[PDB]
Amino acid sequence: GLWDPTLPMIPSANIPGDPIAVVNQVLGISATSAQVTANMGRKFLEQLGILQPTDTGITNAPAGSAQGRIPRVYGRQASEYVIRRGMSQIGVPYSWGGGNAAGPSKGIDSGAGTVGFDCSGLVLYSFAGVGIKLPHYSGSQYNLGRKIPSSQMRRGDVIFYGPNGSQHVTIYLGNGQMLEAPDVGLKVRVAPVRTAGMTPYVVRYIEY
């Protein structure tokens, strides 16, 4: 019983570091997920009227802290933007290892010929819109942000599965539903929350 038995009972794709996210061969440019995330974070802060010269655009709280860069009075707005970004991807194919801060991408290993999202890729893409920078591995995502008891999960919190949160990750939508990139052959979808294999905590990246 350690895993969600509806999905492969293995750790999810683990893509190191700060991958290239944008490649433009005509202009001859490229940029990484962290670059795109910082750019989008600064834009978001500017739209709230709070951009400062010291802001890189990266908005993550120190892991475990209840205080991040985005003010609490703007956190619902931030969270709703993240959710809209993710939900806009419903119907995009799953691809093992797929996705970056810019959108779906070619995957790895099995997913090498498929442009799409995997579980952690969808989560990282969604949160990047407000400057929340996440690693492309569900177990590493579980170690960031602030833990909330699973029984108190709230819309916008992030649900994890398997040992160390390593099997699967999804975005809770409230009302017993979650947004996920599920498995090969499928598409990004809204699905009922599953409790089998779930970690006893969810993760909150945005306070409100």
The residues that are catalytic are 119, 168, 180
Q: 112 is written with which tokens? A: 């090498």
Q: How many helices (H) and strands (E) does the chain have?
A: 4, 10
Tell me, what amino acid is at 172? Y
CA dist 82 and 119 (Å) reads 15
Question: What angle (nearest 5°) sits at the alpha carbon of residue 64, between those of residues 46 and 139?
Answer: 95
The runs of H, that is alpha helices, within 32-99 are: 33-47, 75-87
